[PDB]
Design an enzyme around this catalytic site. Structure first.
Site, PDB file in Angstrom:
ATOM      1  CG  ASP A 128      -2.140   0.972   1.014  1.00 17.08           C
ATOM      2  OD1 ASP A 128      -2.134   1.792   0.075  1.00 17.08           O
ATOM      3  OD2 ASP A 128      -3.060   0.925   1.851  1.00 17.08           O
ATOM      4  NE  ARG A 132      -3.671   5.515   0.999  1.00 18.10           N
ATOM      5  CZ  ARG A 132      -3.602   5.390  -0.321  1.00 18.10           C
ATOM      6  NH1 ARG A 132      -3.599   6.481  -1.088  1.00 18.10           N
ATOM      7  NH2 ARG A 132      -3.550   4.182  -0.869  1.00 18.10           N
ATOM      8  CG  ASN A 133      -0.073   4.417   3.564  1.00 26.24           C
ATOM      9  OD1 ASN A 133      -0.559   4.813   4.628  1.00 26.24           O
ATOM     10  ND2 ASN A 133      -0.771   3.703   2.667  1.00 26.24           N
ATOM     11  CG  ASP A 146       1.900   2.059   8.950  1.00 23.92           C
ATOM     12  OD1 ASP A 146       2.591   1.691   9.926  1.00 23.92           O
ATOM     13  OD2 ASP A 146       1.015   2.934   9.055  1.00 23.92           O
TER      14      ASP A 146
HETATM   15  C1  BXJ Z   1       0.349   6.784  10.588  1.00 31.22           C
HETATM   16  C2  BXJ Z   1      -0.647   7.685  11.308  1.00 31.22           C
HETATM   17  C3  BXJ Z   1      -2.022   7.416  11.111  1.00 31.22           C
HETATM   18  N1  BXJ Z   1      -2.361   6.368  10.274  1.00 31.22           N
HETATM   19  C4  BXJ Z   1      -2.275   5.016  10.619  1.00 31.22           C
HETATM   20  O1  BXJ Z   1      -1.905   4.685  11.732  1.00 31.22           O
HETATM   21  C5  BXJ Z   1      -2.558   4.053   9.589  1.00 31.22           C
HETATM   22  C6  BXJ Z   1      -2.432   4.367   8.238  1.00 31.22           C
HETATM   23  C7  BXJ Z   1      -2.666   3.480   7.204  1.00 31.22           C
HETATM   24  C8  BXJ Z   1      -3.067   2.149   7.453  1.00 31.22           C
HETATM   25  N2  BXJ Z   1      -3.315   1.242   6.422  1.00 31.22           N
HETATM   26  C9  BXJ Z   1      -3.273  -0.200   6.791  1.00 31.22           C
HETATM   27  C10 BXJ Z   1      -1.860  -0.739   6.921  1.00 31.22           C
HETATM   28  C11 BXJ Z   1      -1.007  -0.508   5.665  1.00 31.22           C
HETATM   29  C12 BXJ Z   1      -1.133   0.935   5.181  1.00 31.22           C
HETATM   30  C13 BXJ Z   1      -2.589   1.406   5.131  1.00 31.22           C
HETATM   31  C14 BXJ Z   1      -3.172   1.835   8.823  1.00 31.22           C
HETATM   32  C15 BXJ Z   1      -2.931   2.733   9.853  1.00 31.22           C
HETATM   33  C16 BXJ Z   1      -2.980   8.221  11.742  1.00 31.22           C
HETATM   34  C17 BXJ Z   1      -2.542   9.251  12.557  1.00 31.22           C
HETATM   35  C18 BXJ Z   1      -1.169   9.495  12.732  1.00 31.22           C
HETATM   36  C19 BXJ Z   1      -0.158   8.717  12.134  1.00 31.22           C
HETATM   37  C20 BXJ Z   1       1.281   9.051  12.396  1.00 31.22           C
HETATM   38  C21 BXJ Z   1       2.307   8.127  12.627  1.00 31.22           C
HETATM   39  N3  BXJ Z   1       3.599   8.542  12.870  1.00 31.22           N
HETATM   40  C22 BXJ Z   1       3.947   9.886  12.952  1.00 31.22           C
HETATM   41  O2  BXJ Z   1       5.098  10.187  13.174  1.00 31.22           O
HETATM   42  C23 BXJ Z   1       2.845  10.828  12.727  1.00 31.22           C
HETATM   43  N4  BXJ Z   1       3.193  12.132  12.786  1.00 31.22           N
HETATM   44  C24 BXJ Z   1       2.450  13.283  12.690  1.00 31.22           C
HETATM   45  C25 BXJ Z   1       3.033  14.503  12.982  1.00 31.22           C
HETATM   46  C26 BXJ Z   1       2.319  15.651  12.932  1.00 31.22           C
HETATM   47  C27 BXJ Z   1       0.983  15.813  12.634  1.00 31.22           C
HETATM   48  C28 BXJ Z   1       0.302  17.135  12.596  1.00 31.22           C
HETATM   49  O3  BXJ Z   1      -0.622  17.380  13.358  1.00 31.22           O
HETATM   50  N5  BXJ Z   1       0.703  18.166  11.694  1.00 31.22           N
HETATM   51  C29 BXJ Z   1       1.818  18.002  10.718  1.00 31.22           C
HETATM   52  C30 BXJ Z   1       2.881  19.083  10.947  1.00 31.22           C
HETATM   53  O4  BXJ Z   1       2.355  20.382  10.855  1.00 31.22           O
HETATM   54  C31 BXJ Z   1       1.260  20.587  11.741  1.00 31.22           C
HETATM   55  C32 BXJ Z   1       0.167  19.498  11.556  1.00 31.22           C
HETATM   56  C33 BXJ Z   1       0.304  14.579  12.351  1.00 31.22           C
HETATM   57  N6  BXJ Z   1      -1.026  14.567  12.034  1.00 31.22           N
HETATM   58  C34 BXJ Z   1       1.069  13.375  12.411  1.00 31.22           C
HETATM   59  N7  BXJ Z   1       1.626  10.398  12.473  1.00 31.22           N
END
Ligand code: BXJ
Length: 265
Positions: A128, A132-133, A146
């Site tokens: 995937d 977005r990933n 991921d």
């Molecule tokens: C990953 C993820 C998901 N999503 C999944 O968990 C997930 C995805 C796909 C999946 N699928 C199934 C599995 C295969 C793939 C598809 C499964 C789960 C949801 C929320 C957060 C995160 C992460 C993870 N690590 C980070 O470091 C991070 N960091 C930051 C930093 C800043 C911010 C922020 O606020 N801002 C940015 C900077 O300027 C200001 C605004 C933010 N929003 C995030 N966010």
């Protein structure tokens, strides 16, 4: 296999929700920034993931978002990963559209291609890959997130190729027709990711539905050249979209192509 002690994790901020539920920002032992997936009950094939998680932790590369460890002695289980302060690449592109030079866009492609060449060399499929990933750290380095977790999703709208969450717009014909995943289906997705980068985060095949996208790419429709992509860059992403999987390059070849364009520029 690294079973992190949950007492060593301090939760600090809500980062939002993904396919597995809530994700938090925190620290390990008061020092190391981490992201923590709290796996929602019913969202994941948990015994399957636990049985196989060590392989994913052993994937070590500067351009992969590290899966450091897990917490599985309680419910919900936790997945502990490298924190990336600038969030996902898709939003990073859209929020800074007027600040990128084309050299920086090519460097983002190089970052991802290096990670995928490493996964390819371990015969490990992402399944995937998309903007977005990918995540972006505080110094603008892009890393792939991921990898391999798609296999553990329990959600028929995501696992069915006609479901509304399936990544149709990043899938080659043989995935849409036969569920045939390989390094070459990651190659196709990487090409679409290059298109996302050079379009500064536009949605591929916007205004087409998922099934219209599937119909038309199977008949040869391809994404147009973004304004910011030179013809040399477009040739690289287009090579990822050969109808026949065995005519697509490897990530080793793509990396060589990207470095050649850098040296020429
Ligand atoms: C990953 C993820 C998901 N999503 C999944 O968990 C997930 C995805 C796909 C999946 N699928 C199934 C599995 C295969 C793939 C598809 C499964 C789960 C949801 C929320 C957060 C995160 C992460 C993870 N690590 C980070 O470091 C991070 N960091 C930051 C930093 C800043 C911010 C922020 O606020 N801002 C940015 C900077 O300027 C200001 C605004 C933010 N929003 C995030 N966010």
């Amino acid at each position: 296999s690294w079973e992190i002690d949950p007492k060593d994790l301090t939760f600090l901020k809500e980062l939002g929700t993904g396919q597995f539920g809530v994700v938090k920002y925190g620290k390990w032992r008061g020092q190391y920034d981490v992201a923590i997936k709290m796996i929602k009950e019913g969202s994941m094939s948990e015994d399957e993931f636990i049985e196989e998680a060590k392989v994913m932790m052993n994937l070590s590369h500067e351009k992969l978002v590290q899966l450091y460890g897990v917490c599985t002695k309680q419910r919900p289980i936790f997945i502990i990963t490298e924190y990336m302060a600038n969030g996902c690449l898709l939003n990073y592109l859209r929020e800074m559209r007027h600040r990128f030079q084309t050299q920086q866009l090519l460097e983002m492609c190089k970052d991802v291609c290096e990670a995928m060449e490493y996964l390819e060399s371990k015969q490990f499929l992402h399944r995937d890959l998309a903007a977005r990933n990918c995540l972006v750290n505080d110094q603008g380095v892009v890393k792939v997130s991921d990898f391999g977790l798609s296999a553990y999703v329990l959600d028929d709208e995501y696992t069915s190729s006609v479901g509304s969450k399936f990544p149709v717009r990043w899938s080659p014909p043989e995935v849409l027709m036969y569920s045939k995943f390989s390094s070459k289906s990651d190659i196709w997705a990487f090409g679409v990711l290059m298109w996302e980068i050079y379009s500064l985060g536009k949605m591929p095949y916007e205004r087409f539905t998922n099934s219209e996208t599937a119909e038309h790419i199977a008949q040869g429709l391809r994404l147009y050249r973004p304004h910011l992509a030179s013809e040399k860059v477009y040739t690289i992403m287009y090579s990822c979209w050969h109808e026949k999987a065995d005519e697509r390059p490897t990530f080793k070849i793509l990396l060589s192509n990207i470095l050649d364009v850098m040296d020429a520029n």
